Amino acid sequence: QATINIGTIGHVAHGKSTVVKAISGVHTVRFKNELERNITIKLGYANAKIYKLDDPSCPRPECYRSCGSSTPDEFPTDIPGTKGNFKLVRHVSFVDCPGHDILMATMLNGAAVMDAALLLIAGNESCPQPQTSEHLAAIEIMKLKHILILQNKIDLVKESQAKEQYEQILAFVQGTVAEGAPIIPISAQLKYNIEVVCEYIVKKIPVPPRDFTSEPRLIVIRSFDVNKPGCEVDDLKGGVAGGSILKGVLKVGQEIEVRPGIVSKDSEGKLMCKPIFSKIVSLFAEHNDLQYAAPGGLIGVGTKIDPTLCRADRMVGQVLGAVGALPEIFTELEISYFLLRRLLGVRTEGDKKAAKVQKLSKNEVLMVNIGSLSTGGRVSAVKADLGKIVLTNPVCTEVGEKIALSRRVEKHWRLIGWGQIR
């Protein structure tokens, strides 16, 4: 099915299509297709069957040679082995996190359910690169360190200009685990070293310690509707709630709720909400049917929620625990937090605007990434280590793992620190 979740995370102007298909072969796609301007800004899915030929490449299903199509200038010829009915090692799953500075928040939601990351570095922009400072320290808080620094766009960028950047991005994430992350120089043009990289996504990224016997904690970050326009009356179905499960094996036919849910009718205050219970219609394994949803993987969990509950991606960051799920539904929230001394996620060649941020003031909205959830709320009483925020929607902490707090210092909320749920 899937046992791991590797994030394909990378900053602007490095290309996403030639590198994700090199490691997976299944393209990440959504609307506006009309695909993408520079790099993929959507939180897309990618799933594949990585294997070996007693050779650490990831071969194609035609596994005699690996003649890729990333350029016509030089013919990229790597030898992944030969034919002979390859042995299936494992099933690999990817979580394609957004890599622009504008979409930092949805990056934090999709990466909070994953198990691993790749750092896709362009050699084009500034060598003290801001998103490499952003993403890695964000990975450090979300209990992940499975990082492969993958310097992606150095094909026109010379070996001395590429030399400066991976040194200087590592110089600012010196308070972050990225020193156990190998820095792999590859080609987005010659599809090169993918026989070495897909070794590392097996080597550096094994199967994480994943709770199989626990309660199913699906956290949907992507909504899918099989009740598409062009359907009929006797073609009645549910809505597919497809996210990564971080805890507990999930079965077909399970009555699953969305535990943060919806506000009930005539809420004169803030505290009344009901989870939307739904029986699971099917479980997807990269092309294949199963009755089990082994967690630690991006699993298509088709549920019996309504067509409107999946006609848009409306379940971004929702704890879909089973019927009668334990974790509570908070609409006012007591947070403990720390504020990072660098305004992380934005830094130019003049080091703007990563200076020290003014403290949080009361009755000011701030994005909290609680568990893996995407919600915004104003703080009622703000202290140094005691934040009392009230949320516009009742949201569920799956567990008190981490929150990511951002302050609206510009057009988008920008990371000022992190914290935890008290």
């Binding site: 030089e74 620094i149 310097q151 150095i154 094909d155 070996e159 991976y166 040194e167 590592l170 990225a178 020193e179 156990g180 992350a181 190998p182 820095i183 792999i184 120089p185 590859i186 080609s187 010659l190 090169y192 070293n193 070495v196 590392y200």
Partner: peptide, 17 residues
């Protein structure tokens, strides 16, 4: 960290013009 750089340096940059 950088031993995976310099090994894949001579592997990639000897194939780059």
């Amino acid at each position: 960290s950088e031993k995976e750089y310099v090994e894949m340096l001579d592997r990639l940059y000897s194939k780059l013009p």
